[PDB]
Amino acid sequence: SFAGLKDADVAAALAACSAADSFKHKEFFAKVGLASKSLDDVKKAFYVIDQDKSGFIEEDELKLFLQNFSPSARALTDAETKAFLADGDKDGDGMIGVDEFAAMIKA
Ligand SMILES: [Ca+2]
Ligand SMILES: [Ca+2]
Ligand SMILES: [N+]
């Protein structure tokens, strides 16, 4: 479940990455419906994923990204986590800010 998205899409996206090392963030964002959301709505999702309200999604929040969609979902592997970070971190600061998050989703 994730507010604004359809539960069945979220559940399908989680099933599609059930195997370790099968997560592909851009595929997940399409399947769960975020790639089809407005920029406004994508921004709302960022602030939720930023669990500590620091203004950035840090690596630990990427590792636990799926928990925002189901608390019992798996952690991303270290490989998946670092791949997610490298793809999104366009300014190189080691974190994902709101504009970087939207850019990955609305590409
Ligand atoms: Ca944060
Ligand atoms: Ca960054
Ligand atoms: N963090």
Give the domains, in start order, of the chain with CATH numbers. 1-107 (1.10.238.10)
Q: Cα(99)–Cα(55) distance, rounded to whole angstroms?
A: 11
**Ligand 2 mean position to 40 CA, how many Å?**
20
Does residue 60 have its Cβ closer than 6 Å to ligand 3? yes
User: 1 CB contacts (<8 Å, ≥6 apart)?
Assistant: 7, 10, 69, 70
Compute how many other C-beta atoms are within 10 angstroms of the C-beta atom of residue 23.
23
User: Which residues are registered as beta bridge partners of 96?
Assistant: 57
Q: Cα separation of 51 and 31, whole Å?
A: 22
Q: Give the residue whose CA is nearest to atom 1 of ligand 3.
A: 58
Provide the annotated binding site for Ca(2+): 50, 52, 54, 56, 58, 61, 89, 91, 93, 95, 100
Dihedral, CA of residue 19, residue 21, residue 22 and residue 25, to nearest 10: 130
